[PDB]
Structure 1
């Protein structure tokens, strides 16, 4: 069987515009010249996110009715550019006329007939305002750059929106308002309209009240307008309108296009407008959310609880001794981002993995989205999760359960339990509990769904699956075959449609007695709308399973007889223990809370880091697949070096060097690491340093200078294909170093900024800024990297090593000579020539509102480039200008924002949303601050900083932090500022904790891996070198008497810490009371740690594996 693709059957056209709808009149794709206007495509079971609601007020009730889409009771007629919806709501008769005019302008003309005392209308419209590709790739991201301006016109509120992030070359625009009726209130974000409560109730919260009339610049661009209320006795008529422009290079200052709007309003099509068939749902009800569990029920299902989070004495979340994290219903209804989880199969940890199976799931009944095998974008069976509030709830795998006469889609459970192997949902039903589990198999490319009635009661179910079989829903036809209870799914025309994985297939094992269809079973007349919705009806069962297999290379394996969760959980526990070298903190007395948070989080961060490495995607950032060049060089390499996964790092490095670009001899920004030849050949200015630093770190850790002699190819810039001109890794390095030498500004060793540094929002706004800026952060990184390379290469190429030392020293000299003034490292220097220089992000830049930058302060310290005086000053500057309760900030003031046009920096001046790097607390940079503090031996500050970004019981540690998912990494911390203007004005509230702060994007980040390295290597102080162990703790007094279990060179040992201010030496290490000999480490800021030979360490370990570490702060 060939599954066809969904095509929207209602197609409205007019000059430069194609607006399509599903048969219920739900929005599908609204396109004006290449610009997609809506944010979300409707689906055949939920409809679309937009609507028009009639509300009727009575003395004892408020009622609300959708007028459009499949949830209205509307009949529909269509012409070539017009739709007419007709129906009744109570005893009001209505018509809604949709018009698509030639002017990139549309209208919803409403007509109401009847008799009632008080009514109003709410207009509701999700908005994208980007190319179709940008919208599809990430709606949240696109929304962040969509800047809303609010005005009063003739008929109250009008909302004008400019997309600040370039779409092709264009800055597109929307305007929305009302005509013939006043819009008395407005909102601009989906969180305002639907509310968090929607995730349980399935009712938009705003429908019960008044819109707030505030512009919230967040991730769910969603315009709502509320009319003045009116009585009806007779007929009343009025319209809403929209305007789309593909390019509006200026900032928005006023209502525009008034004359065009008037011309468009006179527009009517000449053609006939004829009835069309509207399909209707059959015995399908509203969604089903579980009732909440009370304290007694929680206690019964979860008797053993740790790290309990409570708010007003109600339990929100907790951890278990089995290493699970459990989230109770009330917590999800208070987190702006939805609780979720990524499952990933195990792989051989000595090699770069391939064909790794992954799946995403979310608390609110998204049981399996984005099931993939290998490439997370292309090698996909199930559609991605989108949005935040589950308005569109048809993606991936979903479950309907028959309650009374009606199938009801499961949404919000009573509890949601995550472990590294699986997720479990607990739904309270009438006198029963339904348990759903989606879990990864060990050693097999499988995810398994199990459904179990606890009371062994029988139910009817429909399990739906929005198929892709490729990167996107609705894009390609699918080949589906069935042999008994085994389905096989694969792309049609696999060689051609997939040159690179021509054998890509999937299989599903389905229950014995089930029937198979598309969405036809949902509809009264059995009409198929979406043929790629794979529906499985399972009648009168108390349990069932669906087993899902992925094969990137067609190595099909038979299904097991029994699929047991517990066995997988046990195998994954061991794999994750080994991955972190059996890390475990203990004490004989009460373990300190900080240590208890580290034991709980270490395995969660290891999982996040391993995903970031092997299966590169996140929760919000679903579109990844590739390795970022600077990304793989940080989180994964630092994680793997810390835990002794050296063979893996070697293989990563070989793969990485194979992706260096022929000719330019830099790296791409990102590249696929599988068989897909895709990369981004244009790079930022810092990227080149990262593979150089990483190979040098690898060489220092292992002594494996052999890597330098490996013969390794390059890739071509344009088509990302192998060049078949291999050279030694040493020569790869020499070529990359030449690109660095050629960046010196003339007369100096100042490294030109080029395409930007670490901060992707700080790309230069023009070519003069690109050529003439110098990033002090980049300068410091260069110095550091070239010094590290010098050492790594010293034994192999004496001469190149001397040239590397000269470079590093000249860079060092220029750093001190040009980038420091009055003891303050400037964030940037602008140097057109010796005669025309200007500091930026420095106190001398008195024109600017920004006078301090974090990044150079931390990197200069990490590298031991900053002398003690400068390091000490750096820390005072942080304390006085950058330090907040939620961590250290990237600058002392926000980047400029003046309506979206860039002057100096690109995305930093374009983002309308206070979030991501624009939040100024980008957690990765805070982690480098921790690293800097550790380098300086400042244990109190370091451990305090470690805790400020630890999501476990975060609200207890940082009182102004809003709670968020406690078992996942959060990438940023942003003040609750609705727009950039308020953010600038009341910025200082961040320093003093007088504004709440909330978490950013989850999971996908270098953070988890570099956090793990801070914990183990820098703070606990256990680091590895060539046949040596380095012991160099930076611990507080509360770690006195605490022990770390850690596997060293394959031997489990126990490091017990003693903090002793009265010692003579800085450090002493003892086993069986014998002092271990070794040499002192080099550190310009404090007394160094100790280097102990591996044979010596291991010999002591054989007699007594309890090492006692005496350290003086």
Structure 2
């Protein structure tokens, strides 16, 4: 059976514009030239995000009626470039005429005829304003760079918008406003229009009130305009309009295109505008959100709770002894980002895995989005989740349940419980609880949905699936065969020709597309795979993925518990059975590490094996710098050494021929895709990681492995392998080649760690020097020197000379008045200027975090400089929510870049522009740990710990507690208010909120901080290093940890009165060893493996005595 693709059947066209609609008149794709104007494509069940709302005010009510789209019940006529919507609302006849003119200008002309006392209109439009590619790739990210300027025009508010991230060279533009009626209020983000409450009510919150008239620069670019209120007794007429320009290189300063708009307003098409058939839903109601559980219900279903989060004494979330995190309804209605989770199949932990299965789900009834097998972009069965508020709610796997006469789509449950192996939703019904579980199979490429009525009551269900079978919805035809209760789905390819999926469905279910939702049984979307299941108290759908066609029979039985238990052991072993305990009350911070470790282990494992996140659904590839940080640090900390060796070989095989640097990112599977343009820090990371591998393992053989390169343009193997050592030599030449003349100052080139600080021109590219890059290069080439020492003496000597020269240029050029400058700009020896240093008095930015922490971490900063670094942090960068990247925001003047690219283009205060990018705060922790500053280090660890965050950082707004957040951003509506009131961040006088979730190096590098740097357990070549940096409160606390395959119990004692720094005892015998080198403090102890293990055979409780 062949599934066709959805094509939007209403197709309006006019000079350089194609605007398409679904048959209910819902927006599909509005394209002007090559710019997509809307943010979200409509779907055949929900319609589209945009609308026009008629509201009617009475003495005891307010009513609101959508005028367009399939939720309006308007009839429709169309021409070549016109739609006419007609209908009535109470006592008002309306017509809405949509005009697509030749000018990249559209109108919604509204005519109202009737009697009523008080009415208004609300205009509502989601806006993307990017290429189709950019909008589809990430709506949220596109929104971040879409800057809105508000003016008063002839008819009140007019919203102008400039897209500040280049779209195929161009900076596109929108303008929206009203004609013939005053817009008396406006909003610019979907959070303002729909509100968080939408996630329960399914009703846009703004419809009950006035728009706020504030420009909120967030992630749901969404323009709303509210008319002045009016009486009706007769006919009233007015319009809304939009203008799209594909290139507006200047910043917005005023309302433009007034003459053009007047010309476009006079435009009407000559052709007949004729009736078209409009489909209508049949027995489909409003969505069903659960009633909220009260205290006694929660107590009943979850008798065993820990780490309870409460606000105003209402329970928001908690953890359980069985390693679950549970989220109550009320919490989801207070988090701006939607609670969600990623499931992933276990793999062999000694090799780079292939064909890993994964699925994403969210608390608000998105049960399974983006089911993939291997490649998280291309090898996909179910469509991606999009947005934040579930306005469009048809993606992936959804469930309809019959309540009374009507099928009703499940949205918000009473509770959502996550475990690393699965997600459970609890929906309160009338005298029943419906329990939905979506869970991963152990050892099998499967995700299973289970639906179960707690009281064994029967119901009718339709389970819908937005298929892709490929990277995108609506892109390709689908082969669907059915044998009994097994469906097989495959595309109708080049690198995964056997790609297929199977679903086992319940035994007397019926199969359709969206036809069953409609009165006429008309198919509109043929790729909506619908499963109607009648009169069942329970059922399941088993979903299998096969990237290489290794099809396996279904099991008879699919049991969540067994999977849960197998994954729990997998995760325990993954973190070497980490567990903190004490005889007395364990400290809260330890309790937080026990609860978070396996969650961060899961997040890190996803980042490694199945690279994608919640907001960042588009991934698939390894980032070169990323795989060297998050996964490698996680795996080196936990002794997954064979895995790191394999990672590193794969990594080196992706080095690019000719240029001999690395791509920014690359697919690690059979898809030859990479980004050959890289930032200037990227080359250092494979060099550092291989060195850290060699130091940890003694495995110098890796340097003799014969490994290929990839071609720049095609990402194909070059079939000219060389030893990894020679790979390294070539990389190192590229570094030497970046010396500025007369110096060993490494050119900035494409940028450093901070992806928002790409150089805005060629001169800045050539002549900037990043102090962080410089420090990283020094550290990397020193580590390289040591790692290669025993193998190639001469190269090791050259590496030493290089590191030394880089060190000398660092001290000689990048430091003034004891302050390490963020950057030096050097045209030549005669023309030099510090930036991100106090001397740059023309700039607002005088201090940069990155070099301060890298220089400490590398032991490059001498003790004095390192101590100065910490003072600079305390005085200029430390905030209650963590340490900031800079002491002031980057420039923003309407979106054109001057020095830095994306940092100067982002309209939204978020991601790196927030200045608290958590990854960098974790490096701060690493630096503190190097300096032995245990009180600052543990305090910093807690400030970014999502568990009970709001109890610890009073101005932090709550967020999902069992997942990593990548940034912390002040609640500032725009860049100008951010700059003006920046100091509020330092004193906690503005609230801060969480950024993007899960997909980051953060969780892995956090885990390393915990284990290696603070608890102080590090593995070396036939040695264990013991070097705790802990507080008095860890005194009497024990870490259980598996060391070289042996479970040990490290009990901490903090003794300020010791003669020595460190002492390690087993059965009262002091373990012999050597002190570690550390220029800032007394070093830890290196104990031989055989000695350590021998001691552990008799008494595996090791007592560590440490003085701060």
With structure 1 as the length reference, what TM-score do the two structures score?
Answer: 1.00
* Offset, 1:73: 1.3
Q: Deviations over 1:679-722 (max 9, x none)?
A: 00000000000000000000000000000000000000000000
The equivalent of 1:495 in structure 2 is none
* Offset, 1:327: 0.1
Q: Whole-Å Cα distance in 1 between the matches of residues 716 and 340 of structure 2? A: 37
The equivalent of 1:930 in structure 2 is 925
Q: Whole-Å Cα distance in 1 between the matches of residues 788 and 689 of structure 2? A: 13
Q: Whole-Å Cα distance in 2 between the matches of residues 525 and 977 of structure 1? A: 49
Q: Whole-Å Cα distance in 1 between the matches of residues 163 and 312 of structure 2? A: 41
Please give the residue correspondences for 1:550-561 in structure 2 after superposition, counting only pairs within 5 Å. 550-561=545-556
Q: Deviations over 1:938-957 (max 9, x none)?
A: 00000000000000000000
* Offset, 1:418: 0.1
Instruction: Report the secondary structure of 2:336's partner residue.
Output: coil
Q: Deviations over 1:369-411 (max 9, x none)?
A: 0000000000000000000000000000000000000000000
* Offset, 1:1102: 0.3
Please give the residue correspondences for 1:115-130 in structure 2 after superposition, counting only pairs within 5 Å. 115-130=115-130
1:225 and 2:220 aligned: no
* Offset, 1:488: 0.1
Q: Whole-Å Cα distance in 2 between the matches of residues 375 and 587 of structure 1? A: 44
Q: Deviations over 1:172-218 (max 9, x none)?
A: 00000000000000000000000000000000000000000000000
Q: Whole-Å Cα distance in 2 between the matches of residues 720 and 1062 of structure 1? A: 60
Q: Whole-Å Cα distance in 2 between the matches of residues 428 and 248 of structure 1? A: 52
* Offset, 1:129: 0.1
* Offset, 1:475: 0.1
* Offset, 1:243: 0.0
* Offset, 1:622: 0.2
**Which 4+ runs in 1 deviate beyond 6 A?**
none
Q: Whole-Å Cα distance in 1 between the matches of residues 520 and 763 of structure 2? A: 65
* Offset, 1:874: 0.1
Q: Deviations over 1:714-761 (max 9, x none)?
A: 000000000000000000000000000000000000000000000000
Instruction: Report the secondary structure of 1:588's partner residue.
Output: coil
Instruction: Report the secondary structure of 2:714's partner residue.
Output: coil
Q: Whole-Å Cα distance in 2 between the matches of residues 875 and 1034 of structure 1? A: 17
> For 1:624, which of 616, 619, 623 is the aligned residue?
619
The equivalent of 1:58 in structure 2 is 58
Instruction: Report the secondary structure of 2:368's partner residue.
Output: strand
* Offset, 1:658: 0.1
Q: Deviations over 1:306-344 (max 9, x none)?
A: 000000000000000000000000000000000000000
1:891 and 2:886 aligned: yes
1:772 and 2:767 aligned: yes
Structure 2 unaligned spans of 5+: none
> For 1:1063, which of 1058, 1067, 1070 is the aligned residue?
1058
Q: Whole-Å Cα distance in 1 between the matches of residues 822 and 280 of structure 2? A: 61
* Offset, 1:426: 0.2
Q: Whole-Å Cα distance in 2 between the matches of residues 1082 and 262 of structure 1? A: 76
> For 2:982, which of 982, 987, 997 is the aligned residue?
987
* Offset, 1:976: 0.1
Q: Deviations over 1:405-461 (max 9, x none)?
A: 000000000000000000000000000000000000000000000000000000000
Q: Whole-Å Cα distance in 1 between the matches of residues 826 and 284 of structure 2? A: 67
Q: Whole-Å Cα distance in 1 between the matches of residues 855 and 176 of structure 2? A: 50
The equivalent of 2:872 in structure 1 is 877
Q: Deviations over 1:121-144 (max 9, x none)?
A: 000000000000000000000000
1:1020 and 2:1015 aligned: yes
Instruction: Report the secondary structure of 2:827's partner residue.
Output: strand
Aligned length: 1108
Q: Deviations over 1:1005-1033 (max 9, x none)?
A: 00000000000000000000000000000
Q: Deviations over 1:758-781 (max 9, x none)?
A: 000000000000000000000000
Q: Whole-Å Cα distance in 2 between the matches of residues 948 and 161 of structure 1? A: 36
Q: Whole-Å Cα distance in 2 between the matches of residues 611 and 55 of structure 1? A: 47
Q: Whole-Å Cα distance in 2 between the matches of residues 499 and 392 of structure 1? A: 32
Q: Whole-Å Cα distance in 1 between the matches of residues 806 and 23 of structure 2? A: 65
Instruction: Report the secondary structure of 1:225's partner residue.
Output: strand
Q: Deviations over 1:1047-1102 (max 9, x none)?
A: 00000000000000000000000000000000000000000000000000000000
Instruction: Report the secondary structure of 1:451's partner residue.
Output: strand
Q: Whole-Å Cα distance in 2 between the matches of residues 568 and 207 of structure 1? A: 45
1:743 and 2:738 aligned: yes
Q: Whole-Å Cα distance in 1 between the matches of residues 865 and 168 of structure 2? A: 44
The equivalent of 2:319 in structure 1 is 319
Q: Deviations over 1:497-521 (max 9, x none)?
A: x110000000000000100000000
Q: Whole-Å Cα distance in 2 between the matches of residues 881 and 461 of structure 1? A: 58
Q: Whole-Å Cα distance in 1 between the matches of residues 1014 and 456 of structure 2? A: 51
Instruction: Report the secondary structure of 1:243's partner residue.
Output: strand
Q: Whole-Å Cα distance in 1 between the matches of residues 896 and 208 of structure 2? A: 38
1:407 and 2:407 aligned: yes
Q: Deviations over 1:210-232 (max 9, x none)?
A: 00000000000000000000000
* Offset, 1:601: 0.2
Instruction: Report the secondary structure of 1:829's partner residue.
Output: strand
The equivalent of 2:177 in structure 1 is 177
* Offset, 1:12: 0.1
Please give the residue correspondences for 1:8-407 in structure 2 after superposition, counting only pairs within 5 Å. 8-407=8-407
Q: Deviations over 1:263-318 (max 9, x none)?
A: 00000000000000000000000000000000000000000000000000000000
Q: Whole-Å Cα distance in 2 between the matches of residues 364 and 833 of structure 1? A: 58
Instruction: Report the secondary structure of 1:707's partner residue.
Output: helix
Q: Whole-Å Cα distance in 2 between the matches of residues 543 and 34 of structure 1? A: 48
Q: Whole-Å Cα distance in 2 between the matches of residues 591 and 513 of structure 1? A: 54
The equivalent of 1:868 in structure 2 is 863
> For 1:955, which of 950, 954, 962 is the aligned residue?
950
Q: Deviations over 1:50-88 (max 9, x none)?
A: 000000000000000000000001000000000000000
1:668 and 2:663 aligned: yes
Q: Whole-Å Cα distance in 2 between the matches of residues 340 and 959 of structure 1? A: 24
Q: Deviations over 1:456-489 (max 9, x none)?
A: 0000000000000000000000000000000000
Instruction: Report the secondary structure of 1:842's partner residue.
Output: coil
Q: Whole-Å Cα distance in 2 between the matches of residues 274 and 438 of structure 1? A: 47
Instruction: Report the secondary structure of 1:297's partner residue.
Output: helix
Q: Whole-Å Cα distance in 2 between the matches of residues 748 and 58 of structure 1? A: 77
Instruction: Report the secondary structure of 1:72's partner residue.
Output: coil
* Offset, 1:575: 0.1
Please give the residue correspondences for 1:629-640 in structure 2 after superposition, counting only pairs within 5 Å. 629-640=624-635
Q: Whole-Å Cα distance in 1 between the matches of residues 532 and 1064 of structure 2? A: 65
* Offset, 1:536: 0.1
Instruction: Report the secondary structure of 1:116's partner residue.
Output: strand
* Offset, 1:973: 0.1
Q: Deviations over 1:635-673 (max 9, x none)?
A: 000000000000000000000000000000000000000
1:600 and 2:559 aligned: no
* Offset, 1:356: 0.2
Q: Whole-Å Cα distance in 2 between the matches of residues 851 and 1016 of structure 1? A: 34
Q: Whole-Å Cα distance in 1 between the matches of residues 1049 and 283 of structure 2? A: 62
CA RMSD in angstroms, aligned pairs only:
0.2
Q: Whole-Å Cα distance in 2 between the matches of residues 430 and 483 of structure 1? A: 37
The equivalent of 1:978 in structure 2 is 973
Instruction: Report the secondary structure of 1:317's partner residue.
Output: strand
* Offset, 1:590: 0.1
Q: Whole-Å Cα distance in 2 between the matches of residues 1104 and 220 of structure 1? A: 59
Q: Deviations over 1:522-569 (max 9, x none)?
A: 000100000000000000000000000000000000000000000000
